[PDB]
Amino acid sequence: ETVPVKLKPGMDGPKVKQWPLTEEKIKALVEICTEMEKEGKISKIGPENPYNTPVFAIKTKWRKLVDFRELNKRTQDFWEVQLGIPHPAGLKKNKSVTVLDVGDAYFSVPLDEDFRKYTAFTIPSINNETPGIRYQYNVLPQGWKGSPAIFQSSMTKILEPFRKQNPDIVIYQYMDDLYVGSDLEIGQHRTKIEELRQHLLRWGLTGYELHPDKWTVQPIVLPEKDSWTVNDIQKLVGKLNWASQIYPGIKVRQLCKLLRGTKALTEVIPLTEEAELELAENREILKEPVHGVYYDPSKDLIAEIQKQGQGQWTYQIYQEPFKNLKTGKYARHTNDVKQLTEAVQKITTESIVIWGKTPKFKLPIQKETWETWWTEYWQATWIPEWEFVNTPPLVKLWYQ
Amino acid sequence: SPISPIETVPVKLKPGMDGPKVKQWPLTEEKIKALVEICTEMEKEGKISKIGPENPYNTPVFAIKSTKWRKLVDFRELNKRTQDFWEVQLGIPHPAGLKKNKSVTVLDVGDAYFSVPLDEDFRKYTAFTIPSINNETPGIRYQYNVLPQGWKGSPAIFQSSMTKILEPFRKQNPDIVIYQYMDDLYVGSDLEIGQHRTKIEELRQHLLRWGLTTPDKKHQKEPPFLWMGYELHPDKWTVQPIVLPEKDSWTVNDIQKLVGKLNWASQIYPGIKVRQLCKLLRGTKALTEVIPLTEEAELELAENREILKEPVHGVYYDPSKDLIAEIQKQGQGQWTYQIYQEPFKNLKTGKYARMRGAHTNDVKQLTEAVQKITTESIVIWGKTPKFKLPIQKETWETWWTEYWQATWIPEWEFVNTPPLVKLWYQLEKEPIVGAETFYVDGAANRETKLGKAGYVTNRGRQKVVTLTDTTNQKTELQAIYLALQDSGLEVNIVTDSQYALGIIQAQPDQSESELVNQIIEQLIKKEKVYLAWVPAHKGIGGNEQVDKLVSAGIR
Ligand SMILES: Cc1ccnc2c1NC(=O)c1cccnc1N2C1CC1
Ligand SMILES: CCOC(=O)C1C(=O)N(O)c2ncccc2C1O
Ligand SMILES: [Mn+2]
Ligand SMILES: [Mn+2]
């Protein structure tokens, strides 16, 4: 039943252009929307509604994903400092975390009359042959951050008995997703999930499986080799020099003492002993977390992704540059964009699990390319913020 | 002129703001007379209705000239106060995306805006006053009951109404294609010149039933239709007549008009070029200044004249066939393309010539042109075409894997149409044994703008040039350039500039910097080049040497 919602003072509703869609996605959306309209979830709108929010189709059954990133910014105060959902620090420590699409719940709750206009979206036509089909939500929409904030009290009710029966089970609600984490054995965990799906089923809802305890760091591995060449030791110091800007205690001097005077690169030079003394003591520091780096909940998260080739991708999460909260990797018909879109999702889930927000991504890709292709492989119910960037050619090898 | 039985569209004003109250300027007697004749005529038709000065709102009126007048209302202030509306379209169709049809008919709506009603609660804000001969009498005051000319919301609402009117007819005539454009309708089908003529009249009835008058059999336009700069036959399309005047003198304005025409023509005429004509407009002068034609511009104009020799048309789209896009390098920075379904019968042509960033190569340019065409195809056809590219799978394969950016060209095939796209040099993965290891560095004094570029080698060699108006970045590129100049066909170059490494590592073959082009010129002449990076100021053999050598008197 409609709880009053409004915008943040000063700012107005979203006016975002709709992306060109392919024939099949448009057809899929026309079907999806004809239905939702019969069931009263959405209603056709007139030109008196100047607002707009992009819509896409994703995945066997096609399904509708609405890009509410813009609306979420303009209602932030509502879903964050009015009806904010608290984040539990235990979720990341769990042995197993299952993610459930609980987003079908929101259609039972009607949306505030005066707010419905801001949820306007459009299904465009091929070659702009017909005017776009315009709609607005009558109920809480999927992908809008206000939805779980409003539903929070209904959710607490639904989960009350299950929470009572399993005090050691962590349940976190982010968006359309419920994050359920336990320290149980896997068979017992997967059973407790099915057990939970039955609770949900009695209210009208309907898995994907993570292991956050097994997220050990990506230590910047320094090479071990027999008979180093001048070139190799230069690459070695460059890696260390950079590592000392983040990790305290990284010593470098002894290595360069071996590089004195203008020498050739291929000239093999013998290694002393002070090298292995510093090297191993460095390796020791890299395999531990960063000392002095802590998450400020009022600062945006940022993630950088570097292409490594051979279907490999390294990434780093931070708020202040070089002050890494977490580094990582990603293993591999499979193309760059497919892998990149898959990596982004992986990194984003981990971020939600750890901090309860999505990071702004710095993407090693051309804007247009990403925009045309990302939906082909996108599977999540949310969309993180993204920028497009030039990966510094040396950041690449450092994390390699 | 019918006033349509439609539902009304609820219009409001921009929050906080009240309606317009702009004073009516007094007009001349012939102007005041003319307005009364017009307004009472509109009054009897239901277009406008009388009110009194209890209604506090006003918008000024005017009358312009022919032996009779037209009434102009300046809705500027109301327009500034009326709410924002949804856009009247997100884009305009390209003819190339239209299905082929046996027959196509134009029906323009009689008296567009005045046929559709205006929301009751907004009518009061459209108040205008026809004043008396001077100060004199209180004026005659009217308000609109229909959508007014030049009002912010009339475009969107009329279009909104038309969509709603057609909706039932569309859904009970699924194999009938109708397109709304302003006060026009384009209707096509595949039925014969008999029952097609029938079907128009069924539509005209449906329109008159909803208070919209459309011309009959005898008064409707004939193919081809002029529309938005196109000619549109039922089975073919082309751009409207392009005529490049032969002038003794070419002014900026003339060249601008030429470029615009050529750009327009290029939708269907293959091989159109405009780089040399465009070059002239750079850092320009007055509209009327005569620009003497460059030889290359003269060559470009002649080529374009030649291409536009005889008329060329485009075909319409067939949904059952795939699309084929072919791309060709036309010269420097210039890329040309064709899209067809059946070998060489073009749906449309086009050109790409952008400069994404300072430094680029043909493989980067080619793949950017691919993305441009890819987007376009989605818009026009709702699918991506099969690509045919002047590049070897292996040339492409190599570039992608090694490159730091993520890329994805959809399904494509090599086509041997020179110039072929290739990389012009490649940096080594391994330092060259028995080759002279140059250590390069630059230095620049920020206030003076003076700089030193230089190298020390493993073989004792040592050079230092002075540069006068420079930046650190330029000095490093200069230093790397020196190392290439005096090294011969096999060199290791270690630098401390990531900027420099970055540019070179991505195999550019053209730049917006002359210095970078000199480096390219050198890199091709080479046989084996290895470039590597070391951090600045970490006691590295040759690096500390050149640094001290270039920092002499500079920092
Ligand atoms: C201007 C325009 C834009 C969009 N579609 C069309 C038209 N008009 C045509 O002349 C036309 C011709 C060929 C095929 N479809 C066309 N039509 C379709 C509607 C019958
Ligand atoms: C800002 C000056 O800092 C330095 O000492 C540096 C310097 O001398 N050189 O040559 C340099 N060369 C390339 C990159 C960065 C630097 C430096 O920071
Ligand atoms: Mn330097
Ligand atoms: Mn230096």
PDB file of C-alpha atoms in Angstrom, chain A residues 134-351:
ATOM      1  CA  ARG A 134       5.576   4.657 -23.772  1.00  0.00           C
ATOM      2  CA  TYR A 135       4.867   3.209 -20.317  1.00  0.00           C
ATOM      3  CA  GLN A 136       5.065   3.892 -16.576  1.00  0.00           C
ATOM      4  CA  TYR A 137       5.023   1.648 -13.492  1.00  0.00           C
ATOM      5  CA  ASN A 138       1.979   1.398 -11.199  1.00  0.00           C
ATOM      6  CA  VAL A 139       3.843  -0.928  -8.832  1.00  0.00           C
ATOM      7  CA  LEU A 140       7.373  -0.990  -7.375  1.00  0.00           C
ATOM      8  CA  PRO A 141       9.696  -1.526 -10.354  1.00  0.00           C
ATOM      9  CA  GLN A 142      12.652  -3.921 -10.579  1.00  0.00           C
ATOM     10  CA  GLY A 143      16.078  -2.279 -10.546  1.00  0.00           C
ATOM     11  CA  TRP A 144      14.869   0.810  -8.696  1.00  0.00           C
ATOM     12  CA  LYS A 145      16.658   1.266  -5.381  1.00  0.00           C
ATOM     13  CA  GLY A 146      13.539   2.613  -3.662  1.00  0.00           C
ATOM     14  CA  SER A 147      11.823  -0.755  -4.197  1.00  0.00           C
ATOM     15  CA  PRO A 148      13.756  -2.866  -1.628  1.00  0.00           C
ATOM     16  CA  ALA A 149      13.749   0.091   0.789  1.00  0.00           C
ATOM     17  CA  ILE A 150       9.946   0.196   0.714  1.00  0.00           C
ATOM     18  CA  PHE A 151       9.617  -3.585   0.692  1.00  0.00           C
ATOM     19  CA  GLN A 152      12.020  -3.948   3.636  1.00  0.00           C
ATOM     20  CA  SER A 153       9.216  -4.281   6.227  1.00  0.00           C
ATOM     21  CA  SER A 154       7.365  -6.874   4.127  1.00  0.00           C
ATOM     22  CA  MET A 155      10.654  -8.718   3.579  1.00  0.00           C
ATOM     23  CA  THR A 156      11.441  -8.778   7.321  1.00  0.00           C
ATOM     24  CA  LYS A 157       8.023 -10.343   7.917  1.00  0.00           C
ATOM     25  CA  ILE A 158       8.522 -13.027   5.229  1.00  0.00           C
ATOM     26  CA  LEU A 159      11.991 -13.888   6.580  1.00  0.00           C
ATOM     27  CA  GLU A 160      11.097 -13.687  10.305  1.00  0.00           C
ATOM     28  CA  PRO A 161      10.378 -17.423  10.918  1.00  0.00           C
ATOM     29  CA  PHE A 162      13.311 -18.629   8.780  1.00  0.00           C
ATOM     30  CA  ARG A 163      15.662 -16.238  10.593  1.00  0.00           C
ATOM     31  CA  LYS A 164      14.284 -17.504  13.926  1.00  0.00           C
ATOM     32  CA  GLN A 165      14.925 -21.115  12.866  1.00  0.00           C
ATOM     33  CA  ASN A 166      18.454 -20.387  11.552  1.00  0.00           C
ATOM     34  CA  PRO A 167      20.198 -17.665  13.639  1.00  0.00           C
ATOM     35  CA  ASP A 168      23.597 -18.426  12.025  1.00  0.00           C
ATOM     36  CA  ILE A 169      22.314 -17.651   8.513  1.00  0.00           C
ATOM     37  CA  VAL A 170      23.157 -14.239   7.092  1.00  0.00           C
ATOM     38  CA  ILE A 171      20.533 -12.717   4.824  1.00  0.00           C
ATOM     39  CA  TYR A 172      21.388  -9.474   3.070  1.00  0.00           C
ATOM     40  CA  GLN A 173      19.095  -7.653   0.673  1.00  0.00           C
ATOM     41  CA  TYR A 174      20.786  -5.469  -1.929  1.00  0.00           C
ATOM     42  CA  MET A 175      18.440  -4.806  -4.833  1.00  0.00           C
ATOM     43  CA  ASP A 176      16.359  -7.434  -6.634  1.00  0.00           C
ATOM     44  CA  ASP A 177      18.675  -9.910  -4.931  1.00  0.00           C
ATOM     45  CA  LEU A 178      18.798 -11.658  -1.603  1.00  0.00           C
ATOM     46  CA  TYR A 179      22.230 -12.728  -0.406  1.00  0.00           C
ATOM     47  CA  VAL A 180      22.008 -15.786   1.807  1.00  0.00           C
ATOM     48  CA  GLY A 181      25.214 -16.957   3.473  1.00  0.00           C
ATOM     49  CA  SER A 182      26.045 -19.814   5.822  1.00  0.00           C
ATOM     50  CA  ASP A 183      29.032 -21.568   7.378  1.00  0.00           C
ATOM     51  CA  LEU A 184      27.337 -24.961   6.915  1.00  0.00           C
ATOM     52  CA  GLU A 185      28.497 -27.891   4.793  1.00  0.00           C
ATOM     53  CA  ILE A 186      27.569 -27.465   1.093  1.00  0.00           C
ATOM     54  CA  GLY A 187      24.812 -30.132   1.017  1.00  0.00           C
ATOM     55  CA  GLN A 188      23.218 -28.603   4.127  1.00  0.00           C
ATOM     56  CA  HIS A 189      23.559 -25.092   2.717  1.00  0.00           C
ATOM     57  CA  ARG A 190      21.912 -25.959  -0.601  1.00  0.00           C
ATOM     58  CA  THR A 191      19.144 -27.643   1.393  1.00  0.00           C
ATOM     59  CA  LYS A 192      18.634 -24.572   3.609  1.00  0.00           C
ATOM     60  CA  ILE A 193      18.319 -22.526   0.397  1.00  0.00           C
ATOM     61  CA  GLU A 194      15.589 -24.791  -1.017  1.00  0.00           C
ATOM     62  CA  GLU A 195      13.998 -24.574   2.433  1.00  0.00           C
ATOM     63  CA  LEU A 196      14.078 -20.757   2.125  1.00  0.00           C
ATOM     64  CA  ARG A 197      12.662 -20.789  -1.418  1.00  0.00           C
ATOM     65  CA  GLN A 198       9.551 -22.445   0.059  1.00  0.00           C
ATOM     66  CA  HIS A 199       9.071 -19.577   2.513  1.00  0.00           C
ATOM     67  CA  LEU A 200       9.397 -17.174  -0.432  1.00  0.00           C
ATOM     68  CA  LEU A 201       7.041 -19.296  -2.576  1.00  0.00           C
ATOM     69  CA  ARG A 202       4.192 -18.739  -0.108  1.00  0.00           C
ATOM     70  CA  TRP A 203       4.374 -14.998  -0.850  1.00  0.00           C
ATOM     71  CA  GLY A 204       4.869 -15.178  -4.643  1.00  0.00           C
ATOM     72  CA  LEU A 205       8.609 -15.365  -5.358  1.00  0.00           C
ATOM     73  CA  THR A 206      11.266 -17.745  -6.759  1.00  0.00           C
ATOM     74  CA  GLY A 207      20.784 -21.249  -7.226  1.00  0.00           C
ATOM     75  CA  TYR A 208      23.776 -18.995  -7.983  1.00  0.00           C
ATOM     76  CA  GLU A 209      26.581 -19.833  -5.557  1.00  0.00           C
ATOM     77  CA  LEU A 210      29.642 -18.002  -4.112  1.00  0.00           C
ATOM     78  CA  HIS A 211      32.447 -18.903  -1.685  1.00  0.00           C
ATOM     79  CA  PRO A 212      33.718 -15.628  -0.109  1.00  0.00           C
ATOM     80  CA  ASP A 213      35.879 -17.293   2.572  1.00  0.00           C
ATOM     81  CA  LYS A 214      37.999 -18.624  -0.310  1.00  0.00           C
ATOM     82  CA  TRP A 215      38.726 -15.151  -1.698  1.00  0.00           C
ATOM     83  CA  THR A 216      42.440 -14.924  -0.888  1.00  0.00           C
ATOM     84  CA  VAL A 217      44.400 -11.944  -2.312  1.00  0.00           C
ATOM     85  CA  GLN A 218      46.081 -11.625  -5.704  1.00  0.00           C
ATOM     86  CA  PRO A 219      49.708 -11.296  -4.536  1.00  0.00           C
ATOM     87  CA  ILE A 220      51.936  -9.486  -7.037  1.00  0.00           C
ATOM     88  CA  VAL A 221      54.129 -12.493  -7.797  1.00  0.00           C
ATOM     89  CA  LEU A 222      57.774 -11.591  -8.382  1.00  0.00           C
ATOM     90  CA  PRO A 223      59.645 -13.968 -10.742  1.00  0.00           C
ATOM     91  CA  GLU A 224      62.121 -16.658  -9.677  1.00  0.00           C
ATOM     92  CA  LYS A 225      64.760 -17.427 -12.303  1.00  0.00           C
ATOM     93  CA  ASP A 226      68.238 -18.881 -12.898  1.00  0.00           C
ATOM     94  CA  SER A 227      70.784 -16.326 -14.208  1.00  0.00           C
ATOM     95  CA  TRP A 228      69.011 -12.949 -14.519  1.00  0.00           C
ATOM     96  CA  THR A 229      69.676 -10.638 -17.462  1.00  0.00           C
ATOM     97  CA  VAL A 230      69.987  -6.828 -17.171  1.00  0.00           C
ATOM     98  CA  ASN A 231      66.542  -6.435 -18.787  1.00  0.00           C
ATOM     99  CA  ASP A 232      64.885  -8.809 -16.302  1.00  0.00           C
ATOM    100  CA  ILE A 233      66.207  -6.945 -13.255  1.00  0.00           C
ATOM    101  CA  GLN A 234      64.988  -3.644 -14.728  1.00  0.00           C
ATOM    102  CA  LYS A 235      61.482  -5.116 -15.047  1.00  0.00           C
ATOM    103  CA  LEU A 236      61.938  -6.389 -11.484  1.00  0.00           C
ATOM    104  CA  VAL A 237      62.715  -2.972  -9.959  1.00  0.00           C
ATOM    105  CA  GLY A 238      59.936  -1.223 -11.909  1.00  0.00           C
ATOM    106  CA  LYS A 239      57.463  -3.668 -10.363  1.00  0.00           C
ATOM    107  CA  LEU A 240      58.908  -3.088  -6.873  1.00  0.00           C
ATOM    108  CA  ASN A 241      59.134   0.709  -7.216  1.00  0.00           C
ATOM    109  CA  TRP A 242      55.405   0.755  -7.944  1.00  0.00           C
ATOM    110  CA  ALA A 243      54.601  -1.732  -5.153  1.00  0.00           C
ATOM    111  CA  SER A 244      56.263   0.599  -2.611  1.00  0.00           C
ATOM    112  CA  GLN A 245      53.664   3.324  -3.320  1.00  0.00           C
ATOM    113  CA  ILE A 246      50.971   1.111  -1.750  1.00  0.00           C
ATOM    114  CA  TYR A 247      52.709  -1.478   0.477  1.00  0.00           C
ATOM    115  CA  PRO A 248      54.772  -0.070   3.390  1.00  0.00           C
ATOM    116  CA  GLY A 249      58.245  -1.576   3.895  1.00  0.00           C
ATOM    117  CA  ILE A 250      59.021  -2.462   0.265  1.00  0.00           C
ATOM    118  CA  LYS A 251      62.807  -2.132  -0.115  1.00  0.00           C
ATOM    119  CA  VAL A 252      64.455  -1.796  -3.541  1.00  0.00           C
ATOM    120  CA  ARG A 253      68.035  -0.487  -3.214  1.00  0.00           C
ATOM    121  CA  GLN A 254      70.128  -3.693  -3.363  1.00  0.00           C
ATOM    122  CA  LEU A 255      68.766  -4.739  -6.780  1.00  0.00           C
ATOM    123  CA  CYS A 256      69.780  -1.506  -8.537  1.00  0.00           C
ATOM    124  CA  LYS A 257      73.290  -1.631  -7.059  1.00  0.00           C
ATOM    125  CA  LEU A 258      73.754  -4.524  -9.501  1.00  0.00           C
ATOM    126  CA  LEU A 259      72.816  -2.109 -12.303  1.00  0.00           C
ATOM    127  CA  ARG A 260      75.637   0.458 -12.244  1.00  0.00           C
ATOM    128  CA  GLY A 261      77.057   2.013 -15.418  1.00  0.00           C
ATOM    129  CA  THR A 262      75.726   1.990 -18.986  1.00  0.00           C
ATOM    130  CA  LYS A 263      75.340  -1.730 -19.804  1.00  0.00           C
ATOM    131  CA  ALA A 264      73.579  -3.757 -22.515  1.00  0.00           C
ATOM    132  CA  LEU A 265      70.243  -5.476 -21.825  1.00  0.00           C
ATOM    133  CA  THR A 266      71.088  -9.031 -22.942  1.00  0.00           C
ATOM    134  CA  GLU A 267      74.322  -9.105 -20.886  1.00  0.00           C
ATOM    135  CA  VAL A 268      73.727 -11.767 -18.230  1.00  0.00           C
ATOM    136  CA  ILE A 269      74.880 -10.519 -14.829  1.00  0.00           C
ATOM    137  CA  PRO A 270      75.357 -12.741 -11.738  1.00  0.00           C
ATOM    138  CA  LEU A 271      73.038 -12.238  -8.754  1.00  0.00           C
ATOM    139  CA  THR A 272      74.478 -11.497  -5.292  1.00  0.00           C
ATOM    140  CA  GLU A 273      72.802 -12.442  -1.991  1.00  0.00           C
ATOM    141  CA  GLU A 274      71.283  -9.147  -0.820  1.00  0.00           C
ATOM    142  CA  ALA A 275      68.939  -9.569  -3.787  1.00  0.00           C
ATOM    143  CA  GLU A 276      67.296 -12.758  -2.445  1.00  0.00           C
ATOM    144  CA  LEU A 277      67.275 -11.178   1.029  1.00  0.00           C
ATOM    145  CA  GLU A 278      65.121  -8.262  -0.182  1.00  0.00           C
ATOM    146  CA  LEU A 279      63.196 -10.300  -2.789  1.00  0.00           C
ATOM    147  CA  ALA A 280      61.865 -12.912  -0.335  1.00  0.00           C
ATOM    148  CA  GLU A 281      61.155 -10.224   2.279  1.00  0.00           C
ATOM    149  CA  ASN A 282      59.194  -8.364  -0.411  1.00  0.00           C
ATOM    150  CA  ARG A 283      57.239 -11.498  -1.446  1.00  0.00           C
ATOM    151  CA  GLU A 284      56.409 -11.807   2.258  1.00  0.00           C
ATOM    152  CA  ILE A 285      54.731  -8.361   2.300  1.00  0.00           C
ATOM    153  CA  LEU A 286      52.849  -8.721  -1.017  1.00  0.00           C
ATOM    154  CA  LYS A 287      51.021 -11.904   0.099  1.00  0.00           C
ATOM    155  CA  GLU A 288      49.445 -10.048   3.067  1.00  0.00           C
ATOM    156  CA  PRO A 289      46.637  -7.425   2.853  1.00  0.00           C
ATOM    157  CA  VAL A 290      47.419  -3.701   2.565  1.00  0.00           C
ATOM    158  CA  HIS A 291      48.252  -2.134   5.900  1.00  0.00           C
ATOM    159  CA  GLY A 292      46.377   1.092   6.665  1.00  0.00           C
ATOM    160  CA  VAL A 293      43.745   0.878   3.935  1.00  0.00           C
ATOM    161  CA  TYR A 294      40.164   1.064   5.159  1.00  0.00           C
ATOM    162  CA  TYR A 295      36.790   1.484   3.516  1.00  0.00           C
ATOM    163  CA  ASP A 296      35.131   4.885   3.973  1.00  0.00           C
ATOM    164  CA  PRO A 297      31.363   4.326   3.500  1.00  0.00           C
ATOM    165  CA  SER A 298      30.963   7.931   2.272  1.00  0.00           C
ATOM    166  CA  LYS A 299      33.481   7.528  -0.585  1.00  0.00           C
ATOM    167  CA  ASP A 300      32.753   6.003  -4.010  1.00  0.00           C
ATOM    168  CA  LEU A 301      34.317   2.664  -4.894  1.00  0.00           C
ATOM    169  CA  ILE A 302      36.364   2.410  -8.080  1.00  0.00           C
ATOM    170  CA  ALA A 303      37.402  -0.681 -10.033  1.00  0.00           C
ATOM    171  CA  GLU A 304      40.055  -0.900 -12.751  1.00  0.00           C
ATOM    172  CA  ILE A 305      40.308  -3.846 -15.113  1.00  0.00           C
ATOM    173  CA  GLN A 306      43.339  -4.647 -17.282  1.00  0.00           C
ATOM    174  CA  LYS A 307      43.377  -6.971 -20.273  1.00  0.00           C
ATOM    175  CA  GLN A 308      46.138  -9.578 -19.871  1.00  0.00           C
ATOM    176  CA  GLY A 309      45.636 -11.603 -23.064  1.00  0.00           C
ATOM    177  CA  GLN A 310      45.343 -15.414 -23.104  1.00  0.00           C
ATOM    178  CA  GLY A 311      41.792 -14.843 -21.782  1.00  0.00           C
ATOM    179  CA  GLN A 312      43.054 -13.346 -18.523  1.00  0.00           C
ATOM    180  CA  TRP A 313      41.916 -10.200 -16.694  1.00  0.00           C
ATOM    181  CA  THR A 314      43.274  -8.503 -13.568  1.00  0.00           C
ATOM    182  CA  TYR A 315      41.292  -5.965 -11.544  1.00  0.00           C
ATOM    183  CA  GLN A 316      41.636  -3.688  -8.510  1.00  0.00           C
ATOM    184  CA  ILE A 317      39.091  -2.109  -6.182  1.00  0.00           C
ATOM    185  CA  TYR A 318      39.985   1.131  -4.375  1.00  0.00           C
ATOM    186  CA  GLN A 319      38.567   4.491  -3.240  1.00  0.00           C
ATOM    187  CA  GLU A 320      41.845   6.420  -3.227  1.00  0.00           C
ATOM    188  CA  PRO A 321      44.271   5.489  -6.050  1.00  0.00           C
ATOM    189  CA  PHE A 322      46.824   2.772  -5.202  1.00  0.00           C
ATOM    190  CA  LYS A 323      45.149   2.244  -1.808  1.00  0.00           C
ATOM    191  CA  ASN A 324      43.690  -1.123  -2.885  1.00  0.00           C
ATOM    192  CA  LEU A 325      40.832  -2.609  -0.901  1.00  0.00           C
ATOM    193  CA  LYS A 326      41.115  -5.787  -3.013  1.00  0.00           C
ATOM    194  CA  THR A 327      42.932  -7.087  -6.103  1.00  0.00           C
ATOM    195  CA  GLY A 328      41.989 -10.105  -8.216  1.00  0.00           C
ATOM    196  CA  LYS A 329      41.910 -12.064 -11.465  1.00  0.00           C
ATOM    197  CA  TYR A 330      39.500 -13.548 -14.008  1.00  0.00           C
ATOM    198  CA  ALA A 331      39.958 -16.662 -16.165  1.00  0.00           C
ATOM    199  CA  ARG A 332      38.465 -17.078 -19.682  1.00  0.00           C
ATOM    200  CA  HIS A 333      33.969 -19.027 -28.759  1.00  0.00           C
ATOM    201  CA  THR A 334      34.843 -16.465 -26.050  1.00  0.00           C
ATOM    202  CA  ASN A 335      35.660 -12.858 -26.925  1.00  0.00           C
ATOM    203  CA  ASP A 336      37.002  -9.721 -25.230  1.00  0.00           C
ATOM    204  CA  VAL A 337      33.630  -8.076 -24.579  1.00  0.00           C
ATOM    205  CA  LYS A 338      32.027 -11.339 -23.394  1.00  0.00           C
ATOM    206  CA  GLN A 339      34.872 -11.817 -20.895  1.00  0.00           C
ATOM    207  CA  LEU A 340      34.871  -8.154 -19.872  1.00  0.00           C
ATOM    208  CA  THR A 341      31.098  -8.147 -19.221  1.00  0.00           C
ATOM    209  CA  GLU A 342      31.503 -11.367 -17.226  1.00  0.00           C
ATOM    210  CA  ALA A 343      34.399  -9.905 -15.220  1.00  0.00           C
ATOM    211  CA  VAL A 344      32.451  -6.715 -14.431  1.00  0.00           C
ATOM    212  CA  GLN A 345      29.603  -8.796 -13.005  1.00  0.00           C
ATOM    213  CA  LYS A 346      31.969 -10.991 -10.993  1.00  0.00           C
ATOM    214  CA  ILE A 347      33.745  -7.941  -9.509  1.00  0.00           C
ATOM    215  CA  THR A 348      30.417  -6.238  -8.805  1.00  0.00           C
ATOM    216  CA  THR A 349      28.919  -9.189  -6.908  1.00  0.00           C
ATOM    217  CA  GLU A 350      32.078  -9.423  -4.770  1.00  0.00           C
ATOM    218  CA  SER A 351      31.776  -5.703  -4.130  1.00  0.00           C
TER     219      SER A 351
END
